[PDB]
Protein backbone atom coordinates (compact mmCIF):
# COMPACT_ATOMS: atom_id res chain seq x y z
CA UNK A 1 0.00 0.00 0.00
CA UNK A 2 1.82 2.99 1.47
CA UNK A 3 5.06 2.52 -0.47
CA UNK A 4 3.31 2.04 -3.79
CA UNK A 5 0.45 4.41 -3.03
CA UNK A 6 2.76 7.19 -1.82
CA UNK A 7 4.75 7.22 -5.07
CA UNK A 8 1.82 6.93 -7.49
CA UNK A 9 2.56 10.47 -8.70
CA UNK A 10 6.23 9.61 -9.18
CA UNK A 11 5.27 6.45 -11.08
CA UNK A 12 3.04 8.48 -13.39
CA UNK A 13 5.97 10.84 -13.99
CA UNK A 14 8.35 7.98 -14.82
CA UNK A 15 5.78 6.33 -17.09
CA UNK A 16 5.23 9.67 -18.83
CA UNK A 17 8.95 10.03 -19.55
CA UNK A 18 9.04 6.49 -20.92
CA UNK A 19 5.90 7.00 -23.01
CA UNK A 20 7.23 10.18 -24.61
CA UNK A 21 10.48 8.43 -25.53
CA UNK A 22 8.45 5.59 -27.02
CA UNK A 23 6.33 8.04 -29.02
CA UNK A 24 9.43 9.53 -30.60
CA UNK A 25 11.22 6.21 -31.18
CA UNK A 26 8.33 4.20 -32.67
CA UNK A 27 9.03 2.53 -36.01
CA UNK A 28 5.44 2.57 -37.29
CA UNK A 29 3.68 5.95 -36.85
CA UNK A 30 0.49 4.08 -35.92
CA UNK A 31 2.43 2.67 -32.98
CA UNK A 32 3.44 6.25 -32.20
CA UNK A 33 -0.25 7.23 -32.10
CA UNK A 34 -0.93 4.32 -29.73
CA UNK A 35 1.84 5.48 -27.41
CA UNK A 36 0.26 8.94 -27.51
CA UNK A 37 -2.99 7.33 -26.33
CA UNK A 38 -0.99 5.67 -23.54
CA UNK A 39 0.46 9.04 -22.51
CA UNK A 40 -3.05 10.47 -22.32
CA UNK A 41 -4.21 7.65 -20.06
CA UNK A 42 -1.21 8.42 -17.83
CA UNK A 43 -2.19 12.11 -17.78
CA UNK A 44 -5.72 11.11 -16.77
CA UNK A 45 -4.21 9.03 -13.96
CA UNK A 46 -2.22 12.02 -12.71
CA UNK A 47 -5.28 14.28 -12.86
CA UNK A 48 -7.29 11.78 -10.82
CA UNK A 49 -4.48 11.60 -8.27
CA UNK A 50 -4.46 15.38 -7.75
CA UNK A 51 -8.25 15.49 -7.34
CA UNK A 52 -9.51 16.26 -10.86
CA UNK A 53 -11.18 13.02 -11.93
CA UNK A 54 -13.69 15.03 -13.94
CA UNK A 55 -10.82 16.26 -16.09
CA UNK A 56 -9.65 12.65 -16.30
CA UNK A 57 -13.00 11.68 -17.80
CA UNK A 58 -13.07 14.73 -20.08
CA UNK A 59 -9.58 13.99 -21.39
CA UNK A 60 -10.56 10.38 -22.07
CA UNK A 61 -13.73 11.55 -23.81
CA UNK A 62 -12.16 14.24 -26.02
CA UNK A 63 -8.48 13.50 -26.63
CA UNK A 64 -8.76 9.73 -26.93
CA UNK A 65 -12.38 9.46 -28.04
CA UNK A 66 -12.13 12.21 -30.65
CA UNK A 67 -8.62 13.48 -31.40
CA UNK A 68 -6.77 10.14 -31.36
CA UNK A 69 -9.59 8.61 -33.42
CA UNK A 70 -9.12 11.33 -36.05
CA UNK A 71 -5.36 10.73 -35.95
CA UNK A 72 -5.80 7.02 -36.66
CA UNK A 73 -8.46 7.67 -39.32
CA UNK A 74 -6.06 9.98 -41.17
CA UNK A 75 -3.01 7.71 -40.98
CA UNK A 76 -5.17 4.84 -42.24
CA UNK A 77 -6.47 6.76 -45.25
CA UNK A 78 -3.17 8.42 -46.14
CA UNK A 79 0.12 7.17 -47.58
CA UNK A 80 2.84 8.13 -45.10
CA UNK A 81 6.56 7.49 -45.52
CA UNK A 82 8.74 7.26 -42.44
CA UNK A 83 12.38 6.51 -41.71
CA UNK A 84 13.63 4.66 -38.65
CA UNK A 85 15.70 6.13 -35.84
CA UNK A 86 19.37 5.45 -36.52
CA UNK A 87 22.84 6.67 -35.60
CA UNK A 88 23.57 7.73 -39.19
CA UNK A 89 20.56 10.07 -39.11
CA UNK A 90 20.28 11.11 -35.47
CA UNK A 91 23.51 10.84 -33.47
CA UNK A 92 24.45 14.24 -34.94
CA UNK A 93 21.74 15.79 -32.74
CA UNK B 94 37.89 54.58 -10.58
CA UNK B 95 38.96 51.44 -8.83
CA UNK B 96 40.65 48.85 -11.06
CA UNK B 97 39.13 45.93 -12.88
CA UNK B 98 40.72 42.60 -11.98
CA UNK B 99 41.95 41.86 -15.49
CA UNK B 100 43.05 38.27 -14.84
CA UNK B 101 39.88 36.99 -13.18
CA UNK B 102 37.49 38.84 -15.47
CA UNK B 103 39.46 37.56 -18.47
CA UNK B 104 39.34 33.99 -17.17
CA UNK B 105 35.57 34.31 -16.82
CA UNK B 106 35.53 35.51 -20.42
CA UNK B 107 37.55 32.47 -21.49
CA UNK B 108 35.00 30.14 -19.91
CA UNK B 109 32.03 31.94 -21.47
CA UNK B 110 33.60 32.03 -24.93
CA UNK B 111 34.38 28.32 -24.75
CA UNK B 112 30.80 27.55 -23.75
CA UNK B 113 29.31 29.74 -26.47
CA UNK B 114 31.59 28.22 -29.09
CA UNK B 115 30.60 24.73 -27.95
CA UNK B 116 26.92 25.66 -28.30
CA UNK B 117 27.51 27.15 -31.76
CA UNK B 118 29.37 23.99 -32.78
CA UNK B 119 26.44 21.83 -31.65
CA UNK B 120 23.97 23.97 -33.60
CA UNK B 121 26.24 23.91 -36.66
CA UNK B 122 26.40 20.12 -36.41
CA UNK B 123 22.61 19.80 -36.23
CA UNK B 124 21.78 22.26 -39.04
CA UNK B 125 24.15 20.93 -41.70
CA UNK B 126 23.57 18.50 -44.56
CA UNK B 127 25.62 15.44 -45.41
CA UNK B 128 26.68 12.66 -43.05
CA UNK B 129 27.43 13.80 -39.51
CA UNK B 130 28.35 11.94 -36.33
CA UNK B 131 28.89 13.10 -32.77
CA UNK B 132 32.65 13.65 -33.16
CA UNK B 133 32.48 15.44 -36.52
CA UNK B 134 30.89 18.46 -34.81
CA UNK B 135 34.34 19.82 -33.95
CA UNK B 136 35.85 18.29 -37.10
CA UNK B 137 33.38 20.25 -39.25
CA UNK B 138 33.04 23.15 -36.81
CA UNK B 139 34.86 25.65 -39.01
CA UNK B 140 36.93 26.62 -36.00
CA UNK B 141 33.84 28.32 -34.57
CA UNK B 142 34.84 27.48 -30.99
CA UNK B 143 38.15 29.23 -31.58
CA UNK B 144 36.30 32.24 -33.01
CA UNK B 145 34.22 32.54 -29.85
CA UNK B 146 37.03 31.90 -27.36
CA UNK B 147 39.58 34.16 -29.03
CA UNK B 148 37.14 37.04 -29.42
CA UNK B 149 36.13 36.72 -25.77
CA UNK B 150 39.73 36.77 -24.52
CA UNK B 151 40.81 39.63 -26.77
CA UNK B 152 37.90 41.93 -25.99
CA UNK B 153 37.67 41.42 -22.23
CA UNK B 154 41.41 41.39 -21.57
CA UNK B 155 42.16 44.45 -23.70
CA UNK B 156 39.20 46.40 -22.32
CA UNK B 157 40.18 45.77 -18.70
CA UNK B 158 43.86 46.44 -19.41
CA UNK B 159 43.22 49.76 -21.14
CA UNK B 160 40.73 50.85 -18.47
CA UNK B 161 43.20 50.10 -15.67
CA UNK B 162 46.11 51.77 -17.48
CA UNK B 163 44.21 54.99 -18.23
CA UNK B 164 42.32 54.91 -14.89
CA UNK B 165 39.22 55.98 -16.82
CA UNK B 166 35.99 54.39 -17.95
CA UNK B 167 34.66 55.67 -21.28
CA UNK B 168 34.25 54.71 -24.93
CA UNK B 169 37.98 54.73 -25.71
CA UNK B 170 38.46 51.46 -23.81
CA UNK B 171 35.79 49.87 -25.98
CA UNK B 172 37.58 51.27 -29.05
CA UNK B 173 40.74 49.43 -27.98
CA UNK B 174 38.80 46.26 -27.16
CA UNK B 175 37.10 46.31 -30.55
CA UNK B 176 40.46 46.91 -32.21
CA UNK B 177 41.88 43.78 -30.58
CA UNK B 178 38.74 41.76 -31.39
CA UNK B 179 38.92 42.86 -35.02
CA UNK B 180 42.58 41.88 -35.04
CA UNK B 181 41.64 38.37 -33.92
CA UNK B 182 38.80 38.02 -36.43
CA UNK B 183 40.83 39.48 -39.31
CA UNK B 184 43.74 37.15 -38.60
CA UNK B 185 41.59 34.42 -40.17
CA UNK B 186 41.81 36.12 -43.59
CA UNK B 187 45.62 35.67 -43.62
CA UNK B 188 46.03 38.95 -45.55
CA UNK B 189 47.54 42.16 -44.21
CA UNK B 190 45.08 44.66 -45.79
CA UNK B 191 42.14 42.66 -44.43
CA UNK B 192 43.78 42.32 -41.02
CA UNK B 193 44.25 46.10 -40.89
CA UNK B 194 40.72 46.71 -42.13
CA UNK B 195 39.16 44.50 -39.47
CA UNK B 196 41.37 46.09 -36.80
CA UNK B 197 40.49 49.71 -37.53
CA UNK B 198 36.83 49.23 -38.49
CA UNK B 199 35.84 46.97 -35.60
CA UNK B 200 37.72 49.34 -33.31
CA UNK B 201 35.76 52.28 -34.71
CA UNK B 202 32.39 50.52 -34.45
CA UNK B 203 33.08 49.51 -30.85
CA UNK B 204 34.31 53.01 -30.04
CA UNK B 205 31.01 54.30 -31.40
CA UNK B 206 29.24 51.78 -29.16
CA UNK B 207 31.27 52.82 -26.12
CA UNK B 208 30.72 56.52 -26.80
CA UNK B 209 26.94 56.11 -26.82
CA UNK B 210 27.15 54.55 -23.36
CA UNK B 211 28.23 50.96 -24.08
CA UNK B 212 24.68 49.62 -23.82
CA UNK B 213 21.98 48.42 -26.19
CA UNK B 214 19.00 49.57 -24.12
CA UNK B 215 18.97 52.95 -22.36
CA UNK B 216 20.31 54.42 -19.13
CA UNK B 217 16.85 55.55 -18.04
CA UNK B 218 17.85 57.90 -15.21
CA UNK B 219 20.25 59.94 -17.37
CA UNK B 220 17.87 60.21 -20.33
CA UNK B 221 16.18 63.48 -21.24
CA UNK B 222 12.76 62.08 -20.33
CA UNK B 223 13.90 61.42 -16.73
CA UNK B 224 15.94 64.58 -16.28
CA UNK B 225 15.57 68.25 -15.34
CA UNK B 226 14.85 70.08 -18.59
CA UNK B 227 13.60 73.42 -19.84
CA UNK B 228 14.75 76.79 -18.56
CA UNK B 229 16.64 76.76 -15.25
CA UNK B 230 15.49 78.76 -12.23
CA UNK B 231 17.00 81.88 -10.67
CA UNK B 232 20.75 81.25 -10.38
CA UNK B 233 21.03 77.46 -10.51
CA UNK B 234 23.89 75.64 -12.16
CA UNK B 235 23.02 74.54 -15.69
CA UNK B 236 22.79 70.78 -16.05
CA UNK B 237 23.20 68.74 -19.20
CA UNK B 238 19.66 69.03 -20.56
CA UNK B 239 18.79 72.46 -19.18
CA UNK B 240 18.69 75.75 -21.09
CA UNK B 241 19.38 79.32 -19.97
CA UNK B 242 19.16 82.75 -21.55
CA UNK B 243 22.62 83.86 -20.36
CA UNK B 244 25.50 81.79 -19.07
CA UNK B 245 28.09 83.19 -16.66
CA UNK B 246 31.09 84.71 -18.43
CA UNK B 247 33.44 83.01 -15.95
CA UNK B 248 32.13 79.64 -17.13
CA UNK B 249 32.80 80.60 -20.76
CA UNK B 250 36.34 81.73 -19.93
CA UNK B 251 36.98 78.46 -18.08
CA UNK B 252 35.56 76.21 -20.80
CA UNK B 253 36.83 77.90 -23.97
CA UNK B 254 39.98 79.40 -22.46
CA UNK B 255 41.27 82.91 -22.91
CA UNK B 256 42.27 84.07 -26.36
CA UNK B 257 40.95 84.58 -29.92
CA UNK B 258 38.06 86.74 -28.72
CA UNK B 259 37.28 85.07 -25.39
CA UNK B 260 38.14 87.55 -22.63
CA UNK B 261 37.44 87.90 -18.93
CA UNK B 262 36.14 91.45 -19.47
CA UNK B 263 34.27 92.87 -22.49
CA UNK B 264 36.53 95.01 -24.66
CA UNK B 265 34.64 98.30 -24.65
CA UNK B 266 34.30 98.26 -20.86
CA UNK B 267 38.01 97.52 -20.45
CA UNK B 268 39.15 100.21 -22.91
CA UNK B 269 36.95 102.92 -21.39
CA UNK B 270 39.10 105.88 -20.48
CA UNK B 271 38.88 106.90 -16.80
Ligand SMILES: CCCCCCCCCCC(CCCCCCCCCC)(CO[C@H]1O[C@@H](CO)[C@H](O[C@@H]2O[C@@H](CO)[C@H](O)[C@@H](O)[C@@H]2O)[C@@H](O)[C@@H]1O)CO[C@H]1O[C@@H](CO)[C@H](O[C@@H]2O[C@@H](CO)[C@H](O)[C@@H](O)[C@@H]2O)[C@@H](O)[C@H]1O
Nearest residue numbers: 166167168169207208209210211219220224235236237238
Ligand atom coordinates in the same frame (compact mmCIF):
# COMPACT_ATOMS: atom_id res chain seq x y z
C1 LIG C 1 26.69 62.62 -34.41
C2 LIG C 1 27.51 61.47 -33.80
C3 LIG C 1 26.64 60.70 -32.77
C4 LIG C 1 27.54 59.90 -31.79
C5 LIG C 1 27.86 60.79 -30.55
C6 LIG C 1 26.81 60.47 -29.44
C7 LIG C 1 27.55 60.13 -28.11
C8 LIG C 1 26.56 60.36 -26.92
C9 LIG C 1 27.36 60.73 -25.63
C10 LIG C 1 27.09 61.75 -24.47
C11 LIG C 1 26.06 61.19 -23.42
C12 LIG C 1 24.59 61.16 -24.01
C13 LIG C 1 24.21 62.54 -24.64
C14 LIG C 1 22.97 62.34 -25.57
C15 LIG C 1 22.55 63.72 -26.18
C16 LIG C 1 21.78 63.50 -27.52
C17 LIG C 1 22.35 62.26 -28.27
C18 LIG C 1 22.88 62.70 -29.66
C19 LIG C 1 22.40 61.73 -30.77
C20 LIG C 1 22.77 60.28 -30.40
C21 LIG C 1 22.95 59.46 -31.70
C22 LIG C 1 26.44 59.68 -23.07
O1 LIG C 1 27.55 59.61 -22.17
C23 LIG C 1 28.07 58.41 -22.13
O2 LIG C 1 29.58 58.45 -22.44
C24 LIG C 1 30.24 57.13 -22.28
C25 LIG C 1 31.75 57.36 -22.36
O3 LIG C 1 32.17 57.44 -23.70
C26 LIG C 1 29.95 56.41 -21.00
O4 LIG C 1 30.48 55.03 -21.20
C27 LIG C 1 30.47 54.24 -20.07
O5 LIG C 1 31.19 54.86 -18.94
C28 LIG C 1 31.08 54.05 -17.71
C29 LIG C 1 29.77 54.36 -17.04
O6 LIG C 1 30.00 55.04 -15.83
C30 LIG C 1 31.18 52.52 -17.89
O7 LIG C 1 32.53 52.09 -17.59
C31 LIG C 1 30.81 51.96 -19.22
O8 LIG C 1 29.38 51.65 -19.21
C32 LIG C 1 31.08 52.87 -20.36
O9 LIG C 1 32.50 53.00 -20.54
C33 LIG C 1 28.51 56.44 -20.67
O10 LIG C 1 28.21 55.96 -19.31
C34 LIG C 1 27.96 57.83 -20.71
O11 LIG C 1 26.60 57.79 -20.30
C35 LIG C 1 26.13 62.11 -22.12
O12 LIG C 1 24.87 62.11 -21.43
C36 LIG C 1 24.99 62.28 -20.05
O13 LIG C 1 25.91 63.39 -19.80
C37 LIG C 1 26.07 63.59 -18.34
C38 LIG C 1 27.29 64.47 -18.19
O14 LIG C 1 27.77 64.86 -19.45
C39 LIG C 1 24.72 64.10 -17.77
O15 LIG C 1 24.64 64.31 -16.30
C40 LIG C 1 25.37 65.38 -15.79
O16 LIG C 1 25.85 65.06 -14.43
C41 LIG C 1 26.99 65.94 -14.11
C42 LIG C 1 28.22 65.33 -14.71
O17 LIG C 1 28.12 63.93 -14.65
C43 LIG C 1 26.79 67.35 -14.67
O18 LIG C 1 27.37 68.30 -13.75
C44 LIG C 1 25.36 67.69 -14.89
O19 LIG C 1 25.31 69.03 -15.47
C45 LIG C 1 24.67 66.75 -15.82
O20 LIG C 1 23.29 66.64 -15.45
C46 LIG C 1 23.70 63.07 -18.02
O21 LIG C 1 22.38 63.61 -17.68
C47 LIG C 1 23.63 62.50 -19.40
O22 LIG C 1 22.84 63.37 -20.22
